[PDB]
Amino acid sequence: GPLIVPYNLPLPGGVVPRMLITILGTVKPNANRIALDFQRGNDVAFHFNPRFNENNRRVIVCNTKLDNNWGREERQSVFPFESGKPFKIQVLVEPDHFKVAVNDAHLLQYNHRVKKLNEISKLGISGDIDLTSASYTMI
Ligand SMILES: OC[C@H]1O[C@@H]([Se][Se][C@@H]2O[C@H](CO)[C@H](O)[C@H](O)[C@H]2O)[C@H](O)[C@@H](O)[C@H]1O
Ligand SMILES: [Cl-]
Ligand SMILES: [Mg+2]
């Protein structure tokens, strides 16, 4: 039941521990990239960036953008997306980190570099996907 990409999901009052964000969709055939951008105004608190061709390898890049400057990248070779295939990304907000799971398997955690979780009020979803659903609940 598509939404059009790029898609902005409002996070009113920011994020809080025990908040679970669920993204359903399908990777396009011959995808180059996916990006989730958790934004505090112009800053990017948490950038989650699967790259399907970085020097002919698949890698997940996580980072934070402060005052338009990217910080130190945390990379992950474990790559559970496939071109043409449906996925579920779950982002669980915990007190000290974002926890990410894809297709019900734990993938990575990302320690909070931005401390004002209550100001992370937008999630940008972009890249080579068909978007079915983006929602949140409290667990
Ligand atoms: O992936 C596609 C793009 O990637 C950036 Se990589 Se530089 C920078 O890195 C940040 C993470 O530290 C963010 O992922 C930015 O979006 C990216 O532009 C490079 O300029 C090119 O390869 C371009 O084609
Ligand atoms: Cl902060
Ligand atoms: Mg295939």
Residue numbers in the entry: 112 to 250
Give the authors' words.
Human galectin-3 (hGal-3), one of the adhesion/growth-regulatory galactose-binding lectins, plays a key role in many different physiological and pathological processes, hence it is involved in a wide variety of diseases such as cancer, inflammation and fibrosis, heart disease and stroke. Structurally, hGal-3 is composed of two domains, an unstructured N terminal collagen-like region with conserved glycine/proline rich repeats that are involved in oligomerization and a C-terminal carbohydrate recognition domain (CRD) that is able to bind sugars. The CRD has a β sandwich-like fold with two antiparallel β sheets, one with a concave sugar binding face (S face, strands S1-S6) consisting of six β strands (S1–S6) and a convex F face formed by five β-strands (F1–F5). The sugar binding site is further divided into subsites A-E, whereby subsite C is the canonical β-galactoside binding site, while subsite D interacts with the second, neighboring sugar ring of the natural ligands.
As a step towards the development of novel hGal-3 inhibitors, we describe a study of the binding of two Se-containing hGal-3 inhibitors, specifically that of di(β-D-galactopyranosyl)selenide (SeDG), in which two galactose rings are linked by one Se atom and a di(β-D-galactopyranosyl)diselenide (DSeDG) analogue with a diseleno bond between the two sugar units. Crystal structures of hGal-3 CRD with SeDG and DSeDG revealed that in both cases a galactose ring (here termed “inner” galactose ring) could bind within the carbohydrate binding site at subsite-C. A very strong peak within the CRD was revealed in the calculated anomalous difference map for the selenium atom in each of the SeDG and DSeDG structures. The Trp181 plays an important role in a stacking interaction with the inner galactose ring of both compounds. In contrast, the distal galactose ring of DSeDG and its Se–Se linkage show evidence of adopting two conformations. One has ~30% occupancy for the distal galactose ring and has its Se–Se linkage orientated toward subsite-D, and the other (~70% occupancy) is oriented towards solvent. The electron density for DSeDG could not be unambiguously traced, however, based on the weak density associated with the distal galactose ring in the 70% occupancy conformation there is an indication that C6′-OH could have the ability to make a hydrogen bonding with water molecule W4. On the other hand, the Se–Se linkage of DSeDG is disordered and more extended within the solvent region. If the Se–Se linkage would orient the distal galactose ring towards subsite-D then there is potential for steric clashes with protein. This offers an explanation for the lower affinity of the DSeDG compared to SeDG. The elongation of the distance between the two Gal-units in the DSeDG is not compatible with forming an ordered structure for the second galactose moiety, explaining its low-level bioactivity.
